[PDB]
Amino acid sequence: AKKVNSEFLTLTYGALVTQMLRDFENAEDVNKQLERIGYNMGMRLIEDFLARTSAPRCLEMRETADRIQQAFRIYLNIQPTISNWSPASDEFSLVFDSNPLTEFVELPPDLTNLRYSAILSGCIRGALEMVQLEVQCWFVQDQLKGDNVTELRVKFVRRLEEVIPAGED
Amino acid sequence: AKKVNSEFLTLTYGALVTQMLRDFENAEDVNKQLERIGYNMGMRLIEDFLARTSAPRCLEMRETADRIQQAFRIYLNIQPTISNWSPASDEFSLVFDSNPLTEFVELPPDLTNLRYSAILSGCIRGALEMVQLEVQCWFVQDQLKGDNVTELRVKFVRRLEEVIP
Amino acid sequence: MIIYGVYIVSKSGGLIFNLDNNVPRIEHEKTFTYPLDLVLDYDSKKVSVSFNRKDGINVGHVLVAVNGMPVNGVTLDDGRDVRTTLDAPENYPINLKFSRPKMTTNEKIFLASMFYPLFAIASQLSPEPKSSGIEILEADTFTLHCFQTLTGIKFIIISETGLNGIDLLLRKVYELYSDYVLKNPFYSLEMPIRCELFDNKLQELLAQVEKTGISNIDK
Amino acid sequence: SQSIVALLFSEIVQYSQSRVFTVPELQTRLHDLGQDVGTRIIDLYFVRERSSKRETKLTQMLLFVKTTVWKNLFGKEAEKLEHANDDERTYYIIEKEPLVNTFISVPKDKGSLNCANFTAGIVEAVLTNCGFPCKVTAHWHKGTTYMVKFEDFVIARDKQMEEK
Amino acid sequence: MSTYYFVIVGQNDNPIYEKEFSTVNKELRKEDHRHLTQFIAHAALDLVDEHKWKTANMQLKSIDRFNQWFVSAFITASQIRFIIVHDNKNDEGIKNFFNEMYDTYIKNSMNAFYRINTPIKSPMFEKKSEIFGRKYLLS
Amino acid sequence: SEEILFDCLHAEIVNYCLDSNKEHDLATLEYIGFTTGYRLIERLTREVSRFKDELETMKFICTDFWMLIYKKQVDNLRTNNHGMYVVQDKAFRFLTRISPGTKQLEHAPKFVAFTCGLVRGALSNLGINSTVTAEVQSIPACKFHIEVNRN
Amino acid sequence: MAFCIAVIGKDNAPLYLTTSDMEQELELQYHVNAALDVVEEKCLIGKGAPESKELYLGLLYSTENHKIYGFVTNTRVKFIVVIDSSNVALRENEVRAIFRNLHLLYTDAICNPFYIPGESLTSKKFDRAVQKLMSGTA
Amino acid sequence: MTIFNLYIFDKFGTLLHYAEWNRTKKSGITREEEAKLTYGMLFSIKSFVSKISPHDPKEGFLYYKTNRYALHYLETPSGLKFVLNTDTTAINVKELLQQLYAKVWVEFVVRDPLWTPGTVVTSELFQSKLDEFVRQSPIFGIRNI
């Protein structure tokens, strides 16, 4: 029954963001720790995303893109769209349509340096850590910032696994 | 006709002991070298015996006696009466009414100390160090020495265990 | 039928969670006589038998308590040595009480520590290419199922030889692992599991797996 | 989903544990966050469930909150709402389902209180904004219960209204 | 015409946010009238306390009088007080007009940045106030 | 079967490699062994006549012995222009235990010596009159030429 | 009644025992019997007796109340006994059996490697088996 | 049942013999260090199964199976070790490896005078016999139990 309301989680997250900003005036630290907790969630979250689909780690990067894409539909019940691949064809752009945590939560223009929902941008980080595929991942257009629809840019950097599943570590 | 395939070992071994004798006069040489060659022999046959029987191993003494009497039964076709059991039961006596290694060589080998079962010792000894049994062997009674019936006495000491793999 | 020991290990391999099912180790009793057929060979505070196995006694099987006197190391609780009573024939016949040495917690920790690189280095240069480490081991009396979550976590549960569909049990323990690690980020990703909630829900899982049928996946 | 909320809330709790050096005012942080969420939970759930209708009767408003907040937050409305006759300021709302243990929780050896306090703070904010300021304490009595302590002023206004 | 003027009285009784809906005139005197109407917000606060204890509904039509002004009071589940001072009443529409500003204030509520009696600063709510006032009251 | 005992025991026969004699075994093993084989021969298809002589070719006793012992008869059995002759086998039983590479020839003649110097008979081709040497050109292909001790 | 059990190699008398149904031959017939046996064996060998088949020869010689049987092994070994009579109750199938057993004991002693071929049958164990054969026939 | 490869190690722990028919991935490290790594593999496995088993290990370890191949083991009471390796689908190969041991290795190693225990087994005859014996019923696969 989805056992949650988008509003409910939105309230919890907004209150938490309020809490950090009340803790540290500088948005730099709130961004740091929010990406830290995004990493933290993304490590355990993949343990459930792989509890349903037993996809092989990475045959190709488009497989990773579709995996992370379906992840949000599993959790946040939104379908992102993958596009804008390089001639190198390793990176990509990913579109989040509607963000439950965002829904009518305005941000102070005196707080612009904050990356509000970057937890997801870090969750995939924490996710991509686990499968031994670290990634330079972040946003190029933010529906939060005033852009039309959310758009995160994924630059994969390097692998951590050999012909054995154990891989380098 | 031609039932008994094997009366040629009682004379092959006879040739062995005679030529060892003619090489070294000492009565105990033809015992100890004969024992070590029968020891290599036992190494070579225990492998095939476990190949057929598929016994797990001689983790116990009574089962070891059973395996050894089975080995004698299959190749040397004699029934070792397992008797004379120690209170600690670490040792048992093998009663061979008829020597299988020989068939009537003769009662006097012209002189004593001529241990006629050294291969038999190897036969019982070698397999043990291959089935990982650091065991001592010795003969308590030999019918060939002017006696009624041959009894052997074999005493396990240490469970041979593999080390530093 | 039961899942003997449900365990799990970190990337380093330290046994995270020694979930022991109820496992009655066999206890043997015998009133022995004058010095023994049993190989009362002393080996590093473990007064056990290596050779001369009788009456369902194994190599591990070690004396626990003669006439209900538990052994401390090698000595009697009253302070006499085992062999001190062994040489004494007046008390004979005397009741020996043998049990296989039950793997304590630190023992199982060391066992998992020594095991881990085995699976980790499991024929790294195996004849077949692109292969994995050991996925299933099957032994004389048990079968171990190890399941790597493609990185990090290794669910290692040992079940009966004839048991089937253990992969689904691994799936459910994966689920309950997530349901636990929900709560404590201060629970480090390599700290041992100490939580009674996981314990009781896995006791429910054990009660279920008393019944073979796993459906709507049974928990 | 459930894993996302359960985890993410867990990081609220433990990040507070980071900024907090002891049990009790850690629990106070949990209470404060429960307040900061209930402070809008209240008037969201007002319109969509109470049909935008106010309940001056403490019993009726409290019962309706008991149904609504639990029905939408955690699905199952709390089992029982009781009023203690010895102390009309102090009533109980027992919820056998632990909302902390929905995400099965920490050993309560190093600590005592949990997300129970967070939902208690939610209840307290709902009460104090409904015009019934109160103290809501999570208690491990008969499992999870929330003891509610009404201000003598508020319960006095109630008693005066309970003079028909 | 009515010199409609809206004011917020918070949970902790401190005023929050105003919004004129009157014709343009007498603005220097309207500053003193704004002080006056904040005082009237307190007086409303006081009276509407017991008057809302009299009832259980959202709207309390009009309570206080000052020989030219009418005071219309709106109480919420948020126990906020939304007050209009106005020479001649327009209550029939403002019941649901208060309902709509209620819904917008809820929108601000989901913005966790806006908090308990935390004074209004968002342009969104200001432009909502402008469009709504030009709709019914300022018209 | 009762083959592995003799196989190993003969391996040790080889094993003692004392630096005195190319015959690790003397013809005594021969004599006693085919004396037992003669115990097997209580019947032989040779006439009873005291006034007439009938010859039992050593070739035939050799092949029957071999079936009783080596279990594969001659492949080539050639009668030399003398009273002597030669036997050739593509394979030998003791040699089935080793590859056909010519590495240690000298063992196999000691193996087959068991048919050398056998307690003879009077008439030519009478069953047991045996003086013979081993001349093996190929590892499984064992060859043995006999020489008449007399003449 | 007396039997003389004799094995014969190429030229000598390896083992001759002169026994009777009661005991060894007390009569001083030793040398005469040995000489007669050797002469008979030599003449018969010169005639043809050397042959492949195990050669049966009953009454191939006939002394004073002692009738001789010769037997031939393809291994060139001979065997002799006599019966102390021109006529006494006995058989010849028994002769076949007893010299078959005599061959059996011969080869079983040949098993003894200390016994080099062509020697006196020294072992009192073997010789008591031989005189047990004697008891079997007398 | 056609297989990937077979390993034969003495109780001491040396490489008595290796055989290959299907091993596809050709390693970079030497097959000697590979043999020693497999022997440590096996002995530590034996320890693991001996000690973590709740009941008496009669013959101890049996085999392991992976995602893509599988490995099977044979402990002689002599202490000799056989190990085979292949893909998945076949009859259980415990009796297969036992038949190979009794019918070939016993037949064409132990019975050889040239064969001296404590050394390697180098003989084209045994290589043949082993090859055609695996090629006796040589379809594929294991699924050993």
Residue numbers in the entry:
A (entry chain G): 10 to 178
B (entry chain A): 10 to 174
C (entry chain D): 1 to 219
D (entry chain F): 31 to 194
E (entry chain E): 1 to 139
F (entry chain B): 2 to 152
G (entry chain H): 1 to 138
H (entry chain C): 1 to 145
Which text from the study accompanies this structure?
The TRAPP complexes are nucleotide exchange factors that play essential roles in membrane traffic and autophagy. TRAPPII activates Rab11, and TRAPPIII activates Rab1, with the two complexes sharing a core of small subunits that affect nucleotide exchange but being distinguished by specific large subunits that are essential for activity in vivo. We report a cryo‐EM structure of the entire Drosophila TRAPPIII complex. The TRAPPIII‐specific subunits TRAPPC8 and TRAPPC11 hold the catalytic core like a pair of tongs, with TRAPPC12 and TRAPPC13 positioned at the joint between them.
